[PDB]
Amino acid sequence: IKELIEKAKVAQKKLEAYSQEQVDVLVKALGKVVYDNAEMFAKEAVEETEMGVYEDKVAKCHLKSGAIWNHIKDKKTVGIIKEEPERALVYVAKPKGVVAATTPITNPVVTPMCNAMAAIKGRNTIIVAPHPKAKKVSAHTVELMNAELKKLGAPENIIQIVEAPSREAAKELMESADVVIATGGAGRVKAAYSSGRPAYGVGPGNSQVIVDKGYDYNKAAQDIITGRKYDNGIICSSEQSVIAPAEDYDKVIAAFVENGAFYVEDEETVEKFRSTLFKDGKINSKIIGKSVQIIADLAGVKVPEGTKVIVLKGKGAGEKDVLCKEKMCPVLVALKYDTFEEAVEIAMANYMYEGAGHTAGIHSDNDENIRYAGTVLPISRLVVNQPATTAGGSFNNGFNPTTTLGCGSWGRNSISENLTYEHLINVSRIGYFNKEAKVPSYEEIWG
Amino acid sequence: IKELIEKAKVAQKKLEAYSQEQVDVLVKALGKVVYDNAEMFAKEAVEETEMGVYEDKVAKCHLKSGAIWNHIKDKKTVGIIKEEPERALVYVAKPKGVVAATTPITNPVVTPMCNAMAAIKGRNTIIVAPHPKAKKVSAHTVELMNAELKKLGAPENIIQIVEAPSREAAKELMESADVVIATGGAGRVKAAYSSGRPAYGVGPGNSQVIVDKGYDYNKAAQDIITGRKYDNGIICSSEQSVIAPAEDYDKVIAAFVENGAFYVEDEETVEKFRSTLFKDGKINSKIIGKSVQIIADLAGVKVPEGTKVIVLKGKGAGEKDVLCKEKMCPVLVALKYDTFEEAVEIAMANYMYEGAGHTAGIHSDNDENIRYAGTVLPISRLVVNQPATTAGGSFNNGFNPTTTLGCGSWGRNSISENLTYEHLINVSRIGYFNKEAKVPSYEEIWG
């Protein structure tokens, strides 16, 4: 670990002499090699991690690589980046140093790519600590990235990976680095914020979805199903619930069935799924990232072939049903509401159960209802009229492309936004003297 | 501690219902009570902490309270605060929760005021843990602030203070709160970033000052002396060195003497001061925040009455002289340089010795030299043509008013900027669907 840190600081000092253009050449090639090898990385990730969908991981590598590069290709991250004469200020971008990045099992390819691109964009180095059950495919990602960096003449060891990620080695890695990124479970995030260094983490996901009255239920069903079933639902922003109005409940369910959902209303059968997804109040690890049919066979319930998601009628909001917790599988819980205010209250109770601070989804044409939900819900991202999995960035919304979605103070994170290059640089200020400025008097200040 | 945390959360939920106007009425009164009681607070702080200057602390309470309120009086921090239709984004400001603030001995009055104003501005509550040698005057500041809050009908216990700050109690306080502010020694800051919660801290100061060739050495001397002597030099941004050109060295020294400096060139006499300021490689606590005459008497060197600062010819740059470390007393170390590039290298070596990430000063008419020093020096603030103590805010510069000056990754802090209301709020995003947006093709992205 001490060797990795020193090799990283030697590389960071050489990388600090790079201009904006030389840094941008490295960052682009990092994302392009993930785009060009999307099919291989996806096949390896599905086999090693034993979760997800091959076709969705290919689209994940194609999307995440292009979306992140297209967003940061023109951003100024080296030296003087911004002038503000109205405040007599000049902004200077400076690297933070060595980045310690712990990557998850759900996104073992794009997360090392995303963190490395954002770190090197600001002239930083990075040491990747992969998830144990995904260390092979994450190392292969780092390998091919370093192969492209070598052909461009980059300083050696700007990206390194821990082949033997011992628990004490990760603790020492986060304490020795200058800034920490923790993308994974809450235990990994809490360790990042206990290392004595500035850290960036994530929180547990549990995307609550409200379908407002009068909205196109067919379009809402297509978006929710696309997000819930994506990569077998292991994305932290994936749809977890369907909070539908009681007066149009059967209409909303009919739209879900029309678009490939299997709806279950009987008390039993629903219990057959509930007892299979959750054992002792915690998610069953054997169904994490598994297909609909695997969950169906384990539950002992016949589910038609071609089904995309399973919708379960919930007993109640919050702790009245364990199905209201996060489900890393293509299963949704359905709940009824009378008023839109009660719909927000339902989503609020599920966030207090689990997932507060992350992402919500809403499908509505009432801008007053959309603004009211975003005002009171403890969330960092409200996704409107689109799949909730676009919270990490799409070419059709304004969220910054990323793989590390910070969840604010609710999720015990430093930021309540998507992780970008900007959180890995120190922005300094040159403050000139504004002799023309006037000092306000007592009346001007306290009047 | 558990009782304090729970009472703070109950108050925070009540304060969360406040509109922008109701919060602003509370924030303004918190600063006004420090302004209106400046003379009393300053007298108590000097007597209890046994450091600083009475008249300088009076001016500190007048400036800090008015400048902080004047900066945040019209800032939107509640609910929807910003529209950005070009990205189809709506920004929502939400509180972080309970703030745990540890306040220093150097600024025992303005720091509880500054942190409380920034926290309540964003509908947060705050628990103050004062420095043991300043707990009485810090508690009196909280008392009078709470007295003004009671008259305005504010919810009870939005500001609390620990009267018995145990070491384990301070640890539990930071771990239990939602966000931590640590303004003090590096030991307090390291504990803040070791609590498992998002933390905001400071780093050790050591403001290096470059006097550029051809500048008005008289004005440069007046500004540097003003900053070095303010509050007997306990401000973390106070001038620490005089990096002067060798070709005009005697001219610069004469300008300092003309404006009240006592310059010492005799190595034996410099050693009498050096052996008094530093004992075993560390600063002598008995001279921290003490006057020139107290330091002179302890050093056994006659210094004329009316002397404002002491200037000592240093043995060399960096570790070649302990006088290049942080000196919390009205004493400056003087160093020569040939080229401006060498002057920056000298300041660089002093920052690697101590103080990297904080503040620098420069007095120059050459904008290229100003921009070069800000581009390479490991600093968060470059103060140009004004006393370096204006780094924490001034009506003639663009630095945000504060008492907590973050030092970035160098000082092991989360931000390289002054602490404001904005670092204590979660900024969420409502992301609408931009159906009219175009998806770039492979050529558009990687071309």
Numbering used by the authors:
A (entry chain A), B (entry chain B): 7 to 453
What's the publication's text?
Succinyl-CoA reductase (SucD) is an acylating aldehyde reductase that catalyzes the NADPH-dependent reduction of succinyl-CoA to succinic semialdehyde (SSA). In Clostridium kluyverii and other Clostridia species, succinyl-CoA reductase operates in fatty acid fermentation, allowing for the co-assimilation of ethanol and succinate. In these fermentations, succinate is first activated to succinyl-CoA, which is then reduced to SSA by SucD before being further converted into 4-hydroxybutyrate. The reaction mechanism of SucD supposedly follows the canonical reaction mechanism of acylating aldehyde dehydrogenases. In these enzymes, the respective acyl-CoA enters the active site, where the acyl moiety is transferred onto an active site cysteine, leading to a covalent acyl-cysteine intermediate.
Our structures at a resolution between 2.1 and 2.2 Å (re-)confirm catalytically active residues and residues necessary for the coordination and binding of mesaconyl-C1-CoA. Each monomer has an extended C-terminal loop that reaches into the second subunit within the complex. An active site cysteine (Cys242) plays a key role by forming a covalent bond with the acyl moiety of the CoA ester and releasing the CoA moiety. Active site residues His364 and Thr365 assist in proton donation to the released CoA.
